[PDB]
Subunit: 311 residues, 4 copies
């Protein structure tokens, strides 16, 4: 099948009585996603991807007539869109996430978060410094064995799979919700020596259950998009906390943490730094970093009560 992404976003646009700008925005982004997907599929045949990916996303978004401020992980500064092409939305994105693993055939992905412009002064970088709680839509595309587009908005999370015979995204999972409790923990344990006592304690309880509990299985792809998507569909928890390398975490607030935290929350899951909901952090820099812990609410909660006890 019935539903294409195009059909779905238009029907949501009309149900919310929008102008249609969102529908242009998402239709454009879908074009860049398809192109990134085919380029990653033929990467080794060539004759940088993240530079081609960045330009694809930038151009299609500029030409959607739906945006005014763009933040890319690949650009030092926020891009302020030409007046002629200006629309009302602010888009934060990571055009090609996990690209230290394109070489290892690793599910990589594009991550985005969309805001309605704040003020009415000339659009500026400050318009992208909004808490994640003001997101109107967010999601990611996962370039894997299939190309999948996960989109979250006020009414929930929907999963769309790229049909390569026609170049359209087909709705395959409506209203996704994560399990309340999972049996998988995901973290890079090579940082063991730098982990705080809370994380250290939780990791230990996962592995040495106070007996007779089966231990959780461990998974860590090393690409956020793959690890978050597994967490969404099969449940459990994902962690990239602060360590010594970065005592503010590694992952980026605006276009890595917020978008995943917004999907998680709309699926019925949680997302926190250990001390506050990721979505209520107010950024001060467009490239700011945040620690993140996200996943099924029972597991996330368990970890947050370890944080509380140690405090």
């Amino acid at each position: 099948n019935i539903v294409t992404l195009t059909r779905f976003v238009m029907e949501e646009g009309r149900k919310a009585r929008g102008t249609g700008e969102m529908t242009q925005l998402l239709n454009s982004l879908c074009t860049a996603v398809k192109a990134i997907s085919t380029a990653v599929r033929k990467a080794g045949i060539a004759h940088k991807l993240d530079v081609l990916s960045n330009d694809l996303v930038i151009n299609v978004l500029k030409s959607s007539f739906a945006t005014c401020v763009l933040v890319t992980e690949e650009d030092k500064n926020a891009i302020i869109v030409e007046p002629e092409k200006r629309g009302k939305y602010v888009v934060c994105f990571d055009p090609l996430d996990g690209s230290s693993n394109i070489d290892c055939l690793v599910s990589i992905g594009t991550i985005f978060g969309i805001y309605r412009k704040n003020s009415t002064d000339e659009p500026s970088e400050k318009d992208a410094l909004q808490p994640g709680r003001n997101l109107v839509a967010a999601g990611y595309a996962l370039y894997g064995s299939a190309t999948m587009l996960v989109l979250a908005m006020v009414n929930g999370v929907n999963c769309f799979m790229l049909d390569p015979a026609i170049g359209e995204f087909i709705l395959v999972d409506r209203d996704v919700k994560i399990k309340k409790k999972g049996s998988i923990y995901s973290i890079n344990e090579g940082y063991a020596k730098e982990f705080d006592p809370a994380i250290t304690e939780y990791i230990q309880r996962k592995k040495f259950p106070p007996d007779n509990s089966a231990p959780y299985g461990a998974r860590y792809v090393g690409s956020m998009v793959a690890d978050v998507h597994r967490t969404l569909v099969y449940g459990g928890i994902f962690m990239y906390p602060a360590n010594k390398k970065s005592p503010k975490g590694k992952l980026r607030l605006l276009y890595e943490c917020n978008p995943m935290a917004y999907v998680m929350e709309k699926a019925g899951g949680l997302a926190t730094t250990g001390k506050e909901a990721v979505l209520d952090i107010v950024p001060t820099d467009i490239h700011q970093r945040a620690p993140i812990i996200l996943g099924s609410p029972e597991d996330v909660t368990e970890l947050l009560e370890i944080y509380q006890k140690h405090a």
Copy 2:
């Protein structure tokens, strides 16, 4: 590029003065691999994959006229090929590996190992009970953001990437070699409570280097073909040792362990149980399990040395 998989195996057949049977076998397999790839890419759009995958591999292999005995993970007993279609090769395969992960859009794969039939009596299940050291060829296809086919034989290991525009696998890396030393370890730490003392000590050295040498990074996708591929291309070590639930290990010797062990050894790596080369084990059952440790020669050796000390 220059070289299609079709051209490469023909060239290799002639250099080896073969009958061409191995060539029809590899070309047939290739058709099954392209078909699996496409079905995984549009799996959510459907309207089991490992049943369809099993059938694809069985069919193209029977019809290649190159094979007499087939062992699949999905079948209780070996399939004996009808006389009219028999050729001389014994093929052991895992048609769709990592299928607990298709749901989480995760690199899954096809694993195969090819034997020359042993005897001259009627072909039977016993013809597949050969040590890995007698392999003529082995490899895997990895269904990821790109489709890769890795093929190892006496002259080395070669990597081919699927060009979806023409349905041909293109040679993208000739004579692949693993790095002598890596910096990544891969294992499900979820089983820590059941790990033997040597694995326990090696893991702790990887996270708390004695030395003020940087800790190894951790990765574990949970699909063998993804984990072995990353090990092959970036180096380090992959481990699936025996634990409690599996005192003989989890992974299958004939169609998971041997192929990967063969690929590794041809790439200049190592592959051991902790006590003997996986490729010298003589299976006693077609679905036998074996513990396995494989990867860069320095990392694996280092582990072997700990086993030695604890003995």
Copy 3:
């Protein structure tokens, strides 16, 4: 590349200050075109096309929220769109033209013509009975060795080629214009015995030039879309006049003749029945037939002066 059809129609929408309905309409139609294109490409692999084609076009157009009255060559009656999905445009189309030749691998095509609704009473079949001169846009998709979408509007004719790696139409020829004079005539000469004296005379002058003129070459694919597209890009003339079989011609006014006549005229060519401009005919039946003669203005004019002389 620079320009996608999607980019192009939106930029035309904004230059004409439209509501965006046209852009939804054309984006939807583009989806059905891609699907028809892949289904015709794999037709023989199956496991009727014009029934699948008709439903594709109908559904995507209904769901565009841009249409109120649909006329298909495959439906007896005009389809009046549900109030909820109603938009202002009336679409006439031939979903799969030339389908007595899918069997012969013949370039077949989809043909459409779009009108703005006339009245304000409830939308009805009468809203599709407009002269071709009221068209706001028209064109065709040609399923050939490449899939091409030719779109004509007030500022001209543009040609877009389907990029199968990303499922987008890329602008490859802007502002197409036909040659003033061609050297090819296209007609089914098997109807010789039924042709009027005007057509008979013109055919004879093409073949037996009053000497020293090179004769025109003859071409007739038997699929309007292929024959018109050749006429557009290389010039010359195309004829499907009245005969005895149908003394009103064979081709359909609303969704075969008008659309081709509108493209021709916007390319700088002509289109007539022999007695009046096709575009000024006012239909009386949605399935009405018209004789048509179209192509480079010098050739069309020559034929029309043969008609005048015989009158």
Copy 4:
């Protein structure tokens, strides 16, 4: 379906007790055909085709180790294959036929005929100067709304359609036979002034049946592979006789006429100059031209009888 082209030629090689050389030759050719297909499908998106096509065919053929002498329409002299790569087959081909029509999105194609080298002296251009009757195999690929590969050999003619999802040609019609009598004639009537008297009389009988039998319908795409394919599948007759500009005809004997004549005869049709079987002509030059008349046995015979009467 059951049968891929790869499987079918292997099966046929074994039944014929071949060396496998013809099998590598056909598989190689197949790769060139898939590549040409894709480049024609995205030709307008570029950023000459017959130069690229020439190079594709030459390269895959040289690298098949199956060939010693190559005749292409695009090369002055025969290409003699380097000793290391030589095999026993002589291949005559038209890499991209109908290329005056790519511009008008029109079915174009690859035509090939394969000979066994004659002598034992050094391979040379003379090895290609064999009557069509010595063909071992011939056919064509037709790049249209679908890509088809038609392959004829001693056991008959077979049609394969390209499945773009897996890059394999699938057997869709086994043992193809032309109808004994058709109802379509195909010829460029643009040359009527230069036609011999027998062709003139046959054309007039087709349009004004003596009999009150329905006139034949006319078709002429202007690309031989398209016209011969329609003739093969629906019946009737295709004609390219000598005229003034070409007193020996236009079409090329070795790589246009012979292959089509071979396909036709294997399908139970006929192929003549008007005076002898095209397949019994002995070429005197690699780029020799021949007049040709081919198609259903009743239609062709009927024409032959008129030639007889006028003699």
